[PDB]
Amino acid sequence: MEYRKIQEALEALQKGRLVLVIDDKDNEGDLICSAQAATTENVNFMATYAKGLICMPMSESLANQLMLSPMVETAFTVSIDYKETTTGISAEERGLTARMCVAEDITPSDFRRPGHMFPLIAKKGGVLERNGHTEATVDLLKLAGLKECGLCCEIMNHDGKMMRTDDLIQFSKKHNIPLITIKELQEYRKVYDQL
Amino acid sequence: MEYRKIQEALEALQKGRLVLVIDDKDNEGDLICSAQAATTENVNFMATYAKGLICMPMSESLANQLMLSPMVETAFTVSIDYKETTTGISAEERGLTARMCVAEDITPSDFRRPGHMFPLIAKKGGVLERNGHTEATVDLLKLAGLKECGLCCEIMNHDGKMMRTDDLIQFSKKHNIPLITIKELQEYRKVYDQL
């Protein structure tokens, strides 16, 4: 609970794996991972076991590097497919679109717009500004030391409604992904990483 | 094959059920259904067994009724969530966003933009213009007599790559959804429903 399995989200993110970020009681749980570790098998795992919309929380700075506009004049930009993908729709090609976003120097026109991966721009003060799943993704990758770009997909339960708190802890102990709630990483950034 | 289980796609669409439209050999298979019959259980079935991006092929006329703009200045408009949904993300609330698109007289500002359902505008000559899964959805609902708005979601195979032709016929005989290929409904509209 508040102390302190933040370290263990961190280390799962830096090893290329998934973290379950639970919106900290309303409530909603999202899988996340770094865009660096958006493998085919991490994207197919969202897409088979979470089943919401797979999106990509990213810093404004990366969004501006990619020249990504807000879709209209949750901070969704226009969508994107890396230009070597063909349909852009499989877990494998969504994964390569994600990983090509954190490529060391890539240019806006290596992505087609619209496409199949959905960047979401995080508020600059992260969860101490807006206590969204976009900003909890970005703030874990930034405290892991990773590029501020990730994936995040909401978990639905079996019948197509959002999976609730005990479903979620059960799923986390079943697939062995580390669990974190947004309220916890807020307390953590109040004391160890303030505004 | 070319003759003639078009009738059986039709009748599955008019009974509220799903049709598997196979891109007619390159190749890609999409579940579809009418927006009239976008129930929670039809959207969760895409979202658990097809797993691509669930989108909504629609006629330009409906898109203009909704005042939907092309997302940048596959014909994706800005996305949408019907305004009574809260997160808009569950199968149930994606389903109600879909069904509220075919409501008898609904107004653009009953949808938030951006959101979680993705209209795709069909070419006016349908698959005899552009031989997409957008235009095969629209043309089946229009030959079923239904409003020209549907859902359509690409099927991925178990490992996150697009499910190929014999996977698809196997899946169709396993869940008992009627199968149609785009080449077949082209021949059908050349002879029974030309431009």
Nearest CA in chain B to A91: B160
- Does B76 contact A156 at a Cβ distance shorter than 8 Å? no
> Of how many residues is chain B composed?
195
Looking at CA atoms only, how far is residue B92 from chain A in angstroms?
6
Half-sphere exposure of A59 (CA within 13 A, CB side): 16
Closest Cα of chain B to A109: distance in Å? 14
Q: Which amino acid is at B8?
A: E
Which burial class, exposed, middle or buried, applies to B195 when counting CB atoms under 10 A from its CB (0-12, 13-18, 19+)?
exposed
Q: Provide the 10 A C-beta neighbour count for residue B154.
A: 23
Q: Are strands B150-154 and A29-34 parallel, antiparallel or unpaired?
A: unpaired
Sign of CA dihedral A120, A125, A128, A129: negative
**Partners of residue B90 in chain A, C-beta under 8 Å:** 156, 160-162
Q: Which chain A residue has its CA at the smallest distance from B91's CA?
A: A160
The side-by-side arrangement of strands in the sheet containing B150-154 is: B150-154, B29-34, B19-22, B179-181
Structure tokens at B26: 């390159």
- The C-alpha atoms of residue B73 and residue B71 are separated, in whole angstroms, by 7
- Alpha-carbon distances, residue B31 vs B51, B180, B187 (angstroms): 10, 11, 21
Residue-wise DSSP of A146-186: --SBEEEEEBB-TTSSB--HHHHHHHHHHHT--EEEHHHHH
Ordered structural domains, chain A, with CATH: 1-195 (3.90.870.10)
Residues of A in contact with B41 (CB under 8 A): 160
Please name which of B195, B174, B152, B170 lies closest in space to residue B51, comparing C-alpha atoms.
B152
CB contact under 8 A, B40 and A160: yes
CB B141 within 8 A of CB B58: no
**Residue A121, beta-bridge partner list:** A58
- Residues B16-48 as b or e (16 or more Cβ within 10 Å = b): ebbbbbbbbeeebbbbbbbbbbbbbebbbbbbe
Cβ contact A76:A118 at 8 Å = yes
- Is the Cβ pair A48, B51 closer than 8 Å? yes
The two three-digit tokens of residue B68, written as one number: 């939907």
CA B89 to chain A, closest CA, distance in angstroms equals 6
- Side chain identity, residue A31: L
Query: How far off is chain A from B108, nearest CA to CA, in Å?
Result: 14
Q: What is the CA radius of gyration of chain A?
A: 16
Which residues of chain A lie closer than 8 angstroms to B44, CB-CB? 51, 156, 158-160
Is A81 in contact with A116 (CB distance < 8 Å)? Answer: yes
Tokens at residue A145, please?
């030391």
Resolution in A: 2.0
Assign 3-class secondary structure to chain B.
Answer: CCCCCHHHHHHHHHCCCCEEEECCCCCCEEEEEEHHHCCHHHHHHHHHHHECCCEEEECHHHHHHCCCCECCCCCEECCEEECCCCCCCCHHHHHHHHHHCCCCCCCHHHEEEEEEECEEECCCCHHHCCCCHHHHHHHHHHHCCCCCEEEEEEEECCCCCECCHHHHHHHHHHHCCCEEEHHHHHHHHHHHCCC
Rounded to an integer, what distance in angstroms lies between the CA atom of residue B39 and that of residue B36? 8
CB contact under 8 A, A53 and B89: yes
User: What is chain A written as a DSSP string?
Assistant: --SSSHHHHHHHHHTT--EEEE-S----EEEEEEGGG--HHHHHHIIIIIBS--BEEE-HHHHHHTTPPBS----BB--EEETT-SS--SHHHHHHHHHHTT-SS--GGGEEEEEEE-EEEPPTTGGGT---HHHHHHHHHHHTT--SBEEEEEBB-TTSSB--HHHHHHHHHHHT--EEEHHHHHHHHHHHS--
Q: Answer whether A106 touches B (CB < 8 Å).
A: no
